[PDB]
A paper describes a structure:
In the present study, we conducted structural and functional analyses of the heme-responsive sensor protein [name] (porphyrin-regulated efflux regulator) from the β-hemolytic bacterium [name], which is the most common cause of life-threatening invasive bacterial infections (e.g., septicemia, pneumonia, and meningitis) during the neonatal period. Therefore, [name] promotes the expression of these heme efflux systems in [name] in response to the intracellular heme concentration, likely by binding heme. The monomer consists of six α-helices and two β-strands containing a winged helix-turn-helix (wHTH) motif. This architecture of [name] is similar to that of the multiple antibiotic resistance regulator (MarR) family of transcriptional regulators, in which helices α2–α4 and strands β1–β2 form the DNA-binding domains.
Author numbering:
A (entry chain A), B (entry chain A): 1 to 147
The structure:
């Protein structure tokens, strides 16, 4: 269709605006991306621990990025960063009272968000749409289908 | 799905790259957007004429933009800009030999492009996909469904 790139970008920009507004309403700002992922990981596996190294592996990111991410999670009060008692070179992450509230709020938000967004759309229609995208991606990438 | 905005943007960026590479191969660079639209309009209605004012109305753009667009079409050698003989305040646009070659090349390109992109996708699947997008747009816009 005419002006393919402008129309697609106008839609994603709209969606970004929607998600940002919805997130603020549920007080789960900054949890839409990587912060959310790690908070929900901590919350759902309290048996286990997560070092900064574990964070890198879990999100497939470099040390420097992982380090920036966890420092900002701490800034936000979601986690405390405490070196290993046995070896003070390993940094372990622990969800705070606030990070735990944020976790239970984020789960609700994602449920309500999907209910709202996906109202009037079937599992079959999703499957169809997903296939058309995948086929489009495959037709216009060729040997570069490593994505 | 996780990282919704990053995944959508990575796909549109890919598509932009594809279209740019495909356009260069068919020598119809700069015709992907507004230039194409006006060249194909000129080519398909040689009976009629197109002023800069007609260009504004046809593309729903302001005078200043229309003026920048046609000056760049002239720079590219697709058109000649010649004031009305009767009234030298009306500017009329005329497709050149080159603009006409470009027009017949652009038509081929769009046919091949769609054949390639839409291979392995049915009219029903398009209709489905279109409905899911429209419903998504409607669910996440509400009163701002003026798009
Ligand atoms: C500059 C790029 C493009 C232009 C100018 C363009 C233009 C058009 C035009 C004019 C039509 C209508 C043709 C007709 O009247 O029969 C059309 C149809 C269509 N385009 Fe595009 N298009 C472009 C890129 C794309 C892309 C990237 C996609 C999808 C990846 C796409 C998907 C379609 C589809 C599905 C149709 C419907 C064809 C039909 O069944 O009639 N187009 N496009
Ligand atoms: C930050 C934003 C979002 C996050 C973190 C996110 C995350 C997720 C997650 C984790 C799932 C899997 C849930 C499960 O295991 O049951 C999921 C499913 C899904 N998401 Fe999202 N999502 C987001 C936004 C969106 C958006 C914007 C759309 C579409 C507009 C969307 C469409 C879907 C769909 C269709 C499913 C499939 C649900 C199913 O049938 O199991 N999501 N999302
Ligand atoms: Co310890
Ligand atoms: Co004249």
């Amino acid at each position: 269709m005419e002006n393919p790139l402008q129309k697609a970008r106008i839609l994603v920009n709209q969606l970004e605006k929607y998600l940002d507004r919805y997130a603020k309403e549920y007080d789960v700002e900054h949890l839409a991306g990587p912060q959310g992922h790690l908070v929900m990981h901590l919350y759902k596996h309290p048996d286990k621990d997560m070092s900064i190294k574990d964070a890198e592996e879990i999100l497939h990111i470099s040390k420097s990025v992982a380090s920036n991410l966890v420092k900002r999670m701490e800034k936000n009060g979601f986690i405390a960063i405490v070196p290993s008692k046995t070896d003070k070179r390993v940094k372990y992450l622990y969800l705070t009272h606030l990070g735990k509230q944020k976790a239970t709020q984020f789960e609700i938000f994602l449920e309500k968000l999907h209910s709202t967004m996906l109202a009037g759309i079937t599992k079959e229609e999703i499957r169809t749409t997903k296939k058309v995208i995948r086929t489009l991606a495959k037709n216009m990438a060729m040997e570069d289908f490593d994505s």
